[PDB]
Amino acid sequence: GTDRMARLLGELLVSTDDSGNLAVLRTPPGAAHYLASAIDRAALPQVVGTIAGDDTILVVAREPTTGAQLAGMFENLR
Amino acid sequence: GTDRMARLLGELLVSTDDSGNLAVLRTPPGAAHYLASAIDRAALPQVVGTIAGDDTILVVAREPTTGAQLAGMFENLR
Amino acid sequence: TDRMARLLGELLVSTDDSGNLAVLRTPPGAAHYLASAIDRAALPQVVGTIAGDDTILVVAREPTTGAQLAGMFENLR
Amino acid sequence: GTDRMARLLGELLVSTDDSGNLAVLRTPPGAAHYLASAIDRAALPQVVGTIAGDDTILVVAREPTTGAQLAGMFENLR
Amino acid sequence: DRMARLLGELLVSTDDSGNLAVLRTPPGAAHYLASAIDRAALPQVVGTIAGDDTILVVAREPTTGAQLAGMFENLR
Amino acid sequence: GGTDRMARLLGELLVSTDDSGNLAVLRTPPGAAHYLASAIDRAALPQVVGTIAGDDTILVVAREPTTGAQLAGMFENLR
Ligand SMILES: NC(=[NH2+])NCCC[C@H](N)C(=O)O
Numbered sequence: 001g002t003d004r005m006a007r008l009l010g011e012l013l014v015s016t017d018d019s020g021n022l023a024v025l026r027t028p029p030g031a032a033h034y035l036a037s038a039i040d041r042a043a044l045p046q047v048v049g050t051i052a053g054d055d056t057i058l059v060v061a062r063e064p065t066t067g068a069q070l071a072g073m074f075e076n077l078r
Numbered sequence: 079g080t081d082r083m084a085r086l087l088g089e090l091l092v093s094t095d096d097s098g099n100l101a102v103l104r105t106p107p108g109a110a111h112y113l114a115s116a117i118d119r120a121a122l123p124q125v126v127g128t129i130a131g132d133d134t135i136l137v138v139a140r141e142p143t144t145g146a147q148l149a150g151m152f153e154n155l156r
Numbered sequence: 157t158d159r160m161a162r163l164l165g166e167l168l169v170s171t172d173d174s175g176n177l178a179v180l181r182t183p184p185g186a187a188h189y190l191a192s193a194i195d196r197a198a199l200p201q202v203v204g205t206i207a208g209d210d211t212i213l214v215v216a217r218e219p220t221t222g223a224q225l226a227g228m229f230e231n232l233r
Numbered sequence: 234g235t236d237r238m239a240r241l242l243g244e245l246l247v248s249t250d251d252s253g254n255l256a257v258l259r260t261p262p263g264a265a266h267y268l269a270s271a272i273d274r275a276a277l278p279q280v281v282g283t284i285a286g287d288d289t290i291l292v293v294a295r296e297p298t299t300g301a302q303l304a305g306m307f308e309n310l311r
Numbered sequence: 312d313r314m315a316r317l318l319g320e321l322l323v324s325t326d327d328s329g330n331l332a333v334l335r336t337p338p339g340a341a342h343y344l345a346s347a348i349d350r351a352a353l354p355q356v357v358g359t360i361a362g363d364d365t366i367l368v369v370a371r372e373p374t375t376g377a378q379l380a381g382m383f384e385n386l387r
Numbered sequence: 388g389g390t391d392r393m394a395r396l397l398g399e400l401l402v403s404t405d406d407s408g409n410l411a412v413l414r415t416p417p418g419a420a421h422y423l424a425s426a427i428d429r430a431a432l433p434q435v436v437g438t439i440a441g442d443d444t445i446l447v448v449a450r451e452p453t454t455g456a457q458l459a460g461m462f463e464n465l466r
Pocket residue numbers: 029032052053054055056057188189191192195204205206207208338339363
């Protein structure tokens with residue numbers, strides 16, 4: 001689950017950033033749903049859920065984890 | 079649109095959760111847009127807006143209502 | 157960017173906000189097109205956008221608020 | 234499977250039409266993915282695949298079945 | 312906003328194959344243009360499906376995709 | 388590097404290929420359709436008129452006289 005997700009970060013994670021309770025993941029064009037699917041399937045305790053657009057994913061942090069901490073988590077796994 | 083929304087929450091709402099000012103609603107795969115449409119049309123006074131992904135809807139709470147209080151309202155129709 | 161400004165005039169139905177989020181409404185189907193221009197404008201106080209069908213969430217960079225982003229969009233339009 | 238999809242048709246199938254090897258299904262706003270997921274999961278031998286837009290689904294007929302025949306089949310299930 | 316104004320603003324290219332007109336738009340515009348086409352209620356259009364930058368417009372028999380594509384092209 | 392990136396992603400993302408008439412129908416894992424279709428689009432194959440992606444399906448529209456079956460066989464064999 002997490003392993004499959006971490007593999008995909010390599011190719012699919014262009015950058016991370018955050019604001020408040022949100023991690024904002026940028027992907028290549030069109031890749032948001034594919035990387036978001038892998039994140040959802042990993043069912044991280046830190047993650048309430050995700051919404052994918054086209055090249056951006058909003059990852060909603062489960063309190064008290066912050067978006068900045070989630071962003072650092074994804075960066076470390078890349 | 080409140081009654082139609084309630085019917086659709088009954089049919090399509092798999093789970094609710096929250097973080098900060100956000101209620102996170104899960105649906106079966108592909109049903110997020112149809113349910114989010116029903117929510118938008120209800121024009122709830124404590125809802126700023128919604129975005130639907132594929133199986134997840136972010137519903138933005140209007141202060142002073144929190145994501146948790148919003149999710150609780152939805153959950154009570156699930 | 158004024159590609160963004162042109163599309164705000166064309167597509168921005170209304171603005172609203174909550175916490176660190178500006179909520180932009182567009183005609184049905186037009187959210188991705190507006191959001192693209194916003195992304196391309198690369199505003200310092202915008203962390204990113206997610207477009208649905210008729211709604212865009214614009215994530216404000218701390219300590220900018222969603223209300224402030226909303227007013228900026230009204231200003232550029 | 235087909236049962237499940239068939240019970241959606243009263244609510245989700247606004248109209249059917251065809252051209253060549255294609256059936257064009259119209260749905261309410263946002264329901265295209267919701268109905269198309271159900272069609273995909275029915276795994277009909279006369280359907281090669283589907284693409285959902287927002288209020289339209291393109292259902293691709295498996296030869297020798299024509300779009301018009303597929304359209305009739307959905308109408309007959311409704 | 313009307314198809315007849317948006318075709319010029321939103322079309323990158325028109326092309327065709329068989330019963331399909333294939334329209335390309337800038338990134339993210341497919342649904343916005345396709346909405347306009349849907350609302351134009353053209354007798355020779357069975358329906359549209361939009362992805363992100365591409366729309367398939369289904370020609371009503373016996374109209375061909377080339378005939379539809381020509382119409383979209385000429386109104387740009 | 389357009390065609391090579393496409394060839395890589397076909398192997399990684401194709402679940403199955405099929406066809407009907409002037410269409411190749413490509414199936415991907417859930418959510419991967421746009422990312423695969425992007426690569427196809429960027430490869431700009433002279434026999435592909437365009438593509439449309441849903442969530443887990445892609446239609447690739449063949450340029451006449453190339454058929455859906457010919458494109459599908461080309462895609463299948465790049466896996
Ligand atoms: N080709 C596009 N749709 N571009 C716009 C993307 C808008 C927004 N960043 C999202 O991912 O939802």
